[PDB]
Design a protein around this ligand. Structure first.
Ligand SMILES: Nc1nc2c(ncn2[C@@H]2O[C@H](COP(=O)(O)OP(=O)(O)O)[C@@H](O)[C@H]2O)c(=O)[nH]1
Length: 182
């Protein structure tokens, strides 16, 4: 997608705050510091659920990074409610881009998130980023580990990505498009 417009529209602490209009939504989730914000900025050339209007045709919905253990119990609880509410009630949601680090096996938190999404029948685009930190010759090895750890559904997608080199950008947009026009 040639992005000519992208800007935050709301930072929702509650579902009442979600934007109206009914445009398709693609939510993004991953471990804190995995490279989610870098992934977003790459695609568009640049305690709340943040909605970004893209080209006035869809919203990216950025979910606060998970797996950061130095968080209060109340914050973790709030995070859980927020995502559970969103995932289970949002009709506009077409897919979640789950971003993981290609360098290592996905974590227990990644697996939990993936299992949660599949439980609710949510289409997922798995992005394994930081690919540039691994020799090209090992990309397949590391991708196989990601695939087997999450046990990725064959209808989901696994795309290797790098915010450094923009590897995966076109493929990621292409997948978002398939998900939106399902
Ligand atoms: N080498 C490399 N570094 C990356 C990549 N993506 C993110 N980073 C770096 O990893 C750190 C965390 O990335 P960031 O997008 O801020 O993480 P976020 O917390 O998930 O939003 C930053 O220092 C980024 O520069 C990538 O694909 N390749």
């Amino acid at each position: 997608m040639k992005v000519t417009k992208s800007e935050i529209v709301i930072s929702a602490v509650k579902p009442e705050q979600y934007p109206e209009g009914g445009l398709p939504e693609i939510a993004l989730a991953g471990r804190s510091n995995v490279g989610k914000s870098s992934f977003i900025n790459s695609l568009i050339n640049r305690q709340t659920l943040n909605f970004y209007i893209i080209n006035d045709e869809l919203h990216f919905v950025d979910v606060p990074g998970y797996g950061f253990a130095k968080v209060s119990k109340s914050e973790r609880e709030a995070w859980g409610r927020m995502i559970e509410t969103y995932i289970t009630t949002r009709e506009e949601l077409k897919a979640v881009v789950q971003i993981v680090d290609l360098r290592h096996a996905p974590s227990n938190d990644d697996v939990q998130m993936y299992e949660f999404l599949k439980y609710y029948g949510i289409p997922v685009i798995v992005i394994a980023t930081k690919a540039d930190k691994i020799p090209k010759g090992k990309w397949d090895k590391h991708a196989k580990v990601v695939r087997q750890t999450l046990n990725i559904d064959p209808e989901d997608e696994l795309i290797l990505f790098s915010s450094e080199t923009k590897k995966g950008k076109d493929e990621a947009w292409g997948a978002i498009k398939k998900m939106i026009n399902r």
